[PDB]
Amino acid sequence: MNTPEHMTAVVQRFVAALNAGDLDGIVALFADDATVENPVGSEPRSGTAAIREFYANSLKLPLAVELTQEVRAVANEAAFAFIVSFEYQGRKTVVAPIDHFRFNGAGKVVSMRALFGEKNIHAGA
Amino acid sequence: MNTPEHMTAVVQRFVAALNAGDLDGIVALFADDATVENPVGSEPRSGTAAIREFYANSLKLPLAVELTQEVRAVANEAAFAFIVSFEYQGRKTVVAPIDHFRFNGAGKVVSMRALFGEKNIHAGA
Numbered sequence: 645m646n647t648p649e650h651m652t653a654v655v656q657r658f659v660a661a662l663n664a665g666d667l668d669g670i671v672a673l674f675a676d677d678a679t680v681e682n683p684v685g686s687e688p689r690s691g692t693a694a695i696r697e698f699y700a701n702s703l704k705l706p707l708a709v710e711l712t713q714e715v716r717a718v719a720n721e722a723a724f725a726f727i728v729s730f731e732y733q734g735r736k737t738v739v740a741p742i743d744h745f746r747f748n749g750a751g752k753v754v755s756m757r758a759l760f761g762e763k764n765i766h767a768g769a
Numbered sequence: 770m771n772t773p774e775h776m777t778a779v780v781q782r783f784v785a786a787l788n789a790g791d792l793d794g795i796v797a798l799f800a801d802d803a804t805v806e807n808p809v810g811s812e813p814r815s816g817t818a819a820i821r822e823f824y825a826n827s828l829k830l831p832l833a834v835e836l837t838q839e840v841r842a843v844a845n846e847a848a849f850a851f852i853v854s855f856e857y858q859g860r861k862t863v864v865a866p867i868d869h870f871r872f873n874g875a876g877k878v879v880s881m882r883a884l885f886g887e888k889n890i891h892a893g894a
């Protein structure tokens with residue numbers, strides 16, 4: 645039974661896993677046949693193997709992930725605003741996406757879509 | 770093609786029209802066969818008539834709407850975080866949803882979903 649409380653807690657665990665670089669933890673929130681579309685408009689990754697690979701590469705560089713507003717959750721779906729910060733070669737970048745999660749009856753994430761464009765990628769600091 | 774500037778402009782136009790109670794201004798942004806699902810999980814409403822009725826009913830109370838973060842836009846889709854404030858049943862209320870728009874080739878919104886739950890509805894008694 646997908647309660648808003650459960651979906652919201654999952655978003656929190658997702659953000660926490662990214663910050664800790666806990667790959668297994670992240671993957672554990674997704675269903676076996678879950679799909680990840682990053683960014684929106686690209687071919688979705690499908691399956692545990694593909695999802696694990698995506699997050700492995702996405703975590704090569706240490707990330708500071710933070711929820712910037714309250715989580716929106718209703719009818720087996722949740723959306724959240726946040727930022728992802730990292731640095732390379734003394735250059736700071738802050739990406740500000742809006743993620744959309746769809747959950748199944750078992751409470752696992754069956755679909756994730758990260759919506760953000762170049763204007764949401766802020767270089768400099 | 771849907772440029773990030775166009776999708777962002779439409780979102781801004783949407784928020785402005787709501788603030789001004791400009792019913793025609795709002796409906797003009799939608800395709801004649803567009804769908805509105807507000808809130809997410811409810812029965813989708815489609816077609817100009819249904820969409821106009823939804824907004825007319827919504828506008829029966831003065832609405833104070835404002836974007837709270839940068840608009841996210843990429844691949845014919847946009848998502849934004851905002852607040853809708855109004856006084857109802859003797860209580861100042863602030864609703865904080867995250868909306869998602871899908872655009873067609875003519876730059877019209879063909880699908881919109883407003884994701885917000887009871888925990889995103891803040892009534893001040």
Ligand SMILES: C[C@]12CCC(=O)C[C@@H]1CC[C@@H]1[C@@H]2CC[C@]2(C)C(=O)CC[C@@H]12
Nearest residue numbers: 662682702707728737739741743758765
């Ligand atoms: C691709 C991007 C955003 C673009 C970029 O420069 C790299 C960064 C890596 C981490 C990604 C993020 C998009 C949102 C993702 C997909 C999450 O929600 C968790 C990992 C996040």
Ligand SMILES: C[C@]12CCC(=O)C[C@@H]1CC[C@@H]1[C@@H]2CC[C@]2(C)C(=O)CC[C@@H]12
Nearest residue numbers: 787807827828832853857864866868883
């Ligand atoms: C239904 C609700 C939220 C709940 C309520 O009591 C009234 C208010 C009316 C305006 C609606 C808003 C939900 C989000 C909507 C649908 C928008 O994105 C523009 C009009 C907005």
